[PDB]
Scaffold this active site. Structure first.
Site, PDB file in Angstrom:
ATOM      1  N   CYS A  22     -83.353  99.938  42.504  1.00 21.14           N
ATOM      2  CA  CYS A  22     -82.760  98.673  42.104  1.00 21.14           C
ATOM      3  C   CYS A  22     -81.763  98.179  43.122  1.00 21.14           C
ATOM      4  O   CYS A  22     -80.559  98.453  43.022  1.00 21.14           O
ATOM      5  CB  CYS A  22     -82.132  98.749  40.705  1.00 21.14           C
ATOM      6  SG  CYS A  22     -81.558  97.113  40.181  1.00 21.14           S
ATOM      7  N   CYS A  28     -78.933  96.113  41.770  1.00 21.11           N
ATOM      8  CA  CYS A  28     -77.990  97.002  41.039  1.00 21.11           C
ATOM      9  C   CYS A  28     -76.987  97.613  42.000  1.00 21.11           C
ATOM     10  O   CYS A  28     -75.780  97.678  41.703  1.00 21.11           O
ATOM     11  CB  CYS A  28     -78.725  98.118  40.288  1.00 21.11           C
ATOM     12  SG  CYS A  28     -79.933  97.548  39.038  1.00 21.11           S
TER      13      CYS A  28
END
Ligand SMILES: [Fe+3]
Ligand SMILES: [Fe+3]
Lengths: 106, 106
Positions: free
Chosen positions: A31, A34
């Site tokens: 991710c 993220c």
């Protein structure tokens, strides 16, 4: 019943997406957004010490909570006020923008 | 200038998220929602064979295209018609929802 999704890259994107109707899934194994938002949140936590708490929940490890709040992409941020969800931000955002969101609810 | 982000889980969410303004980052190391949507897209590809193409782009490996389309979380699905983006769905959705989105542009 299933057919393989066709892979496209920077090198051939413009040639594959030129005519007709394509749906493209922008995804990744890890991710990236993220990781990008994490130090932003750490700085926000320091800037808002005492006024707002910042917490994180891994959705792969915690499917029950992720399902309760209808988390469909990551990262997703939900502002809670006194245990109730009051705002939602989807995806990476700059520090200034997240601060404005917190400010609306302080 | 940085403060640690407090981890919360399915077990303790009830005890940790209760009072005050609290921002929760729903994130993951790997893209669980990306994994959930892939077989849905494979079924859709079969259902729409010869009407629409379904493609995938790994954003980590292809920064030019990821940047061009302003992908800020994942998965993000973009519908192109004749090479122009005409619709965007952010995150996992069930097959019938995705079908409705293609149909609008067919
Ligand atoms: Fe810093
Ligand atoms: Fe900084």
């Amino acid at each position: 019943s299933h057919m393989a999704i066709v892979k496209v890259t920077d090198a051939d994107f413009d040639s594959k997406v030129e005519s007709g109707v394509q749906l493209v899934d922008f995804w990744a194994t890890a991710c990236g957004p993220c990781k990008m938002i994490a130090p932003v949140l750490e700085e926000l936590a320091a800037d808002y010490e005492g006024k707002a708490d910042i917490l994180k929940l891994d959705v792969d490890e915690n499917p029950s909570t992720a399902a309760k709040y209808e988390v469909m992409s990551i990262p997703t941020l939900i502002v809670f006020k006194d245990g109730q969800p009051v705002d939602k931000v989807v995806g990476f955002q700059p520090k200034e923008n997240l601060a404005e969101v917190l400010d609306k609810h302080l």
